[PDB]
Amino acid sequence: QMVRFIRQEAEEKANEISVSAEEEFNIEKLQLVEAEKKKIRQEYERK
Amino acid sequence: ASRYWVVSLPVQNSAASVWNRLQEQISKHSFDTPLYRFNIPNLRVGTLDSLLALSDDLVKSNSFVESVSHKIRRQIEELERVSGIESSSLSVDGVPVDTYLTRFVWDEAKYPTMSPLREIVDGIHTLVAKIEDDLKVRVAEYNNVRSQLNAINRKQSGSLAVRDLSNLVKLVTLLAVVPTSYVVPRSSKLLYEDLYTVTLFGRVADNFRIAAREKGFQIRDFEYSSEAQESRNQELEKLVHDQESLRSSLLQWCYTSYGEVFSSWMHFCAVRVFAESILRYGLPPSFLACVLAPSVKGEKKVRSILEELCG
């Protein structure tokens, strides 16, 4: 009966991994969307 | 084997009917004494001090001969496959015991130098020591082979405390429990019989633990793959075969070295003939004694004959 439960456990592990990846995705996106107001002070403000 | 059994009598102290009768036509024929000898003097002999030094070193020479004899009689025979070298195969100085003891031809240039034997005796002793060292090397090789023998094959034949992978069934583990229903697919039966297998499954540890060690008698773990056990058994068989071959082929070389040691002992007896001649007669080597392995009655008769030079 736990043969099908193995699939459920694998699905739960994959869902947890995907949830962690998505949670870090917002931070990764904000790492570039934000703080560029500082990097533009060197990329173009130097000009 | 047999220790030294040579008689002591110079040329001037022959115990036979005549001085030259020691070799043949002696009264020993009537008593069936196997005594026989043949002269083989060296080129020259040392002085009185040299004779005394040789007599002193004769004790060490006899000790070395005894050590070689003990090694040859023990290492070869104990292997139960090296004692196949008979008297002819182990002939001393190229002649069997019938002829080796009847002559001193071993005094040729092989072990000694066919020269004043004061240092030639030491040289022959060193050669015999080298031969004994080779025999000891062969014995050590035989011991290492026996260490290779009694290998992993000495363990149990599977489904037991040791080497149980040979009887493995190859979520499950090698249990072989010698004298279950749950969510897990416990409806199974492994091939772990050399023993018995029980219903178990890795999906839920309840059935697996119950079958393995939970109740009754705990099972014995073993390697999962029987290929490793088969390889270990094959290696053990190969090591046993190699040990047997060494006891039959390398120990055949050991038996050849034992025959060489017998030749060295014949040379030592030839030297001891001249040593006794110097001790109880003049310096030049000349002896009329004999070397054999007679019975008690024959030795007593020889002593009665030679009582003119008793100790």
Swiss-Prot record, chain A:
Residue ranges of coiled coil: none
Complex and partners: V-ATPase is a heteromultimeric enzyme composed of a peripheral catalytic V1 complex (components A to H) attached to an integral membrane V0 proton pore complex (components: a, c, c', c'' and d).
Family the UniProt entry places it in: Belongs to the V-ATPase E subunit family.
Protein role: Subunit of the peripheral V1 complex of vacuolar ATPase essential for assembly or catalytic function. V-ATPase is responsible for acidifying a variety of intracellular compartments in eukaryotic cells.
Protein's recorded name: V-type proton ATPase subunit E
Gene source species: Citrus unshiu
First and last residues shown, out of full length: 12 to 58 of 230
